[PDB]
Amino acid sequence: APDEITTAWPVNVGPLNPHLYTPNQMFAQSMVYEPLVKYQADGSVIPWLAKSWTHSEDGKTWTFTLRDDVKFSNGEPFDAEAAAENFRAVLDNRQRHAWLELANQIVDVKALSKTELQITLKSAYYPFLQELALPRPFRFIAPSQFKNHETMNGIKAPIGTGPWILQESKLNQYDVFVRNENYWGEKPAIKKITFNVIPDPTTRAVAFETGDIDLLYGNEGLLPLDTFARFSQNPAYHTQLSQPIETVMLALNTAKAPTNELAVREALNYAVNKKSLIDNALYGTQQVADTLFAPSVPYANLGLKPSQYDPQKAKALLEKAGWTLPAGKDIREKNGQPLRIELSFIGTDALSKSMAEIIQADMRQIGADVSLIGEEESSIYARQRDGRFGMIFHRTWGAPYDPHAFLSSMRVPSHADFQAQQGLADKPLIDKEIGEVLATHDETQRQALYRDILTRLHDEAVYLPISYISMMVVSKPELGNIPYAPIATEIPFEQIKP
Numbered sequence: 001a002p003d004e005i006t007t008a009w010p011v012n013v014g015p016l017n018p019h020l021y022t023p024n025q026m027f028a029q030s031m032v033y034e035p036l037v038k039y040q041a042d043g044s045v046i047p048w049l050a051k052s053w054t055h056s057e058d059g060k061t062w063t064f065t066l067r068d069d070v071k072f073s074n075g076e077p078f079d080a081e082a083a084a085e086n087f088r089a090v091l092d093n094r095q096r097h098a099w100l101e102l103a104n105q106i107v108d109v110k111a112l113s114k115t116e117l118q119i120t121l122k123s124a125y126y127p128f129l130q131e132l133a134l135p136r137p138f139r140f141i142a143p144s145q146f147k148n149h150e151t152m153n154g155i156k157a158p159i160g161t162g163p164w165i166l167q168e169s170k171l172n173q174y175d176v177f178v179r180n181e182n183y184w185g186e187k188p189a190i191k192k193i194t195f196n197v198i199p200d201p202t203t204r205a206v207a208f209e210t211g212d213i214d215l216l217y218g219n220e221g222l223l224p225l226d227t228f229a230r231f232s233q234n235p236a237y238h239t240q241l242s243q244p245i246e247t248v249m250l251a252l253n254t255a256k257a258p259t260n261e262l263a264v265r266e267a268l269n270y271a272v273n274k275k276s277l278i279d280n281a282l283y284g285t286q287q288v289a290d291t292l293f294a295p296s297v298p299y300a301n302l303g304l305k306p307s308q309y310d311p312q313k314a315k316a317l318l319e320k321a322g323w324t325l326p327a328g329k330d331i332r333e334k335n336g337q338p339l340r341i342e343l344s345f346i347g348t349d350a351l352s353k354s355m356a357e358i359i360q361a362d363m364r365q366i367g368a369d370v371s372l373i374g375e376e377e378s379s380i381y382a383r384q385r386d387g388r389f390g391m392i393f394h395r396t397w398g399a400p401y402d403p404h405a406f407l408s409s410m411r412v413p414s415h416a417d418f419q420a421q422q423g424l425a426d427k428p429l430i431d432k433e434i435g436e437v438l439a440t441h442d443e444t445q446r447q448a449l450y451r452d453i454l455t456r457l458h459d460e461a462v463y464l465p466i467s468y469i470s471m472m473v474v475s476k477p478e479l480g481n482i483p484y485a486p487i488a489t490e491i492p493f494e495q496i497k498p
């Protein structure tokens with residue numbers, strides 16, 4: 001067993017290098033590795049590996065007082081030296097962390113003693129603590145497990161301070177974690193967690209039905225949503241659906257015809273029946289999104305005006321912009337050129353494909369010809385990074401990333417959002433303002449900057465918001481109520497208490 005559970009994940013957890021990205025899975029990195037400060041649902045951080053901290057008046061020099069009772073799972077001490085060596089290891093790979101502005105802000109990290117850790121920043125970076133709280137990269141592996149005094153070229157054993165220890169991994173089959181019996185904090189009720197590698201959502205559902213696994217935990221892609229709804233009525237099962245955690249949306253390329261035209265992007269934003277999309281493809285399990293960030297997101301309750309489903313207005317917008325229908329044709333033309341838009345998505349993702357088909361159909365109704373380009377995962381991310389798309393499925397990042405980190409990343413050219421925004425006359429101003437808002441401690445100016453950035457993105461119709469999606473759970477009743485983590489990408493296994 002009752003203290004052992006079996007769950008599933010679409011891939012292995014990875015080697016659990018704390019400082020690297022794919023194929024490392026964030027929830028698993030967070031099981032093993034811990035932050036200086038821990039993110040809370042109310043947006044604050046609490047003391048964690050750091051028990052307290054102070055900062056200079058200019059807000060650029062921070063000194064953390066670390067716990068003195070923490071050991072890595074291999075018995076070696078966690079101290080300021082170990083922490084400082086981890087920051088060096090991360091920043092020796094600084095290029096790869098360009099998306100995360102703290103990685104460009106940290107000027108210096110040194111241990112002043114065994115318990116005092118000093119971090120110096122370029123500027124008074126206000127999201128400092130929240131970005132230290134992220135699953136990666138600023139969490140701590142035993143320096144003994146560095147490879148030639150680095151982590152960027154790999155690690156030895158994935159030795160963290162956290163409540164879970166990786167017991168063993170087997171590529172394309174499973175990962176097994178056990179409870180850290182020498183953990184400095186609260187001991188988890190569960191002693192062993194086995195992750196079965198099951199890439200297909202239907203196969204995950206079947207694995208649960210057959211009893212092969214005890215728990216499914218994930219976003220809207222966790223399992224087929226009609227099946228989830230059926231499960232929710234099955235008295236032998238337990239299901240849960242969280243309050244929304246992030247936005248799913250289309251990104252429209254402002255630098256590529258015909259989505260380079262504001263009037264086209266505005267029309268597209270009136271063309272989709274989002275309610276029907278969610279009821280048709282998402283089995284009514286998710287919420288309609290009118291804005292890049294839900295009004296419940298920090299700094300984003302701005303009274304932005306929704307573009308409600310209105311095919312009539314979509315048509316009028318296109319007509320006014322010179323996109324009219326030729327005799328005997330359903331697809332509009334302007335300067336002899338058809339209103340054709342390519343929508344790129346992961347071809348094997350049945351849910352994305354379903355939504356893509358609905359979007360294609362809705363947009364045909366107002367005279368836009370959407371071509372579906374379903375491709376393998378690597379091809380889609382290649383398109384995102386280089387802007388080789390007309391429209392692309394996209395999502396925000398959830399707490400604590402939304403909105404500051406998501407916005408920060410819009411400045412990085414090798415991301416979808418920069419690429420989608422590249423055609424905007426105001427893109428330089430937007431990027432300047434994103435830089436400014438992150439270093440602003442004038443709360444009035446901070447809100448004004450966020451308002452301007454988000455309003456410009458909204459008014460310029462860069463995105464086609466579709467849904468605010470939720471975390472979902474399917475479980476054996478004996479496991480009880482399953483908690484959600486403050487960080488949308490973490491899974492609070494240590495809080496499960498049958």
Ligand SMILES: COc1cccc(CN(CCN(CC(=O)O)Cc2ccccc2SC)CC(=O)O)c1O
Pocket residue numbers: 021022026099136381396397398401489
């Ligand atoms: C579930 O995945 C994420 C959940 C929340 C935020 C992000 C954004 N990531 C930003 C850094 N990405 C690295 C990666 O995910 O491998 C950047 C990036 C590069 C290429 C393609 C995608 C992405 S993240 C959309 C944070 C992270 O991965 O640590 C996620 O990727």
Ligand SMILES: [Cl-]
Pocket residue numbers: 022023
């Ligand atoms: Cl991945």
Ligand SMILES: [Cl-]
Pocket residue numbers: 098414
């Ligand atoms: Cl890059």
Ligand SMILES: [Cl-]
Pocket residue numbers: 428429430432
């Ligand atoms: Cl400017």
Ligand SMILES: [Fe+3]
Pocket residue numbers: none
């Ligand atoms: Fe990422």
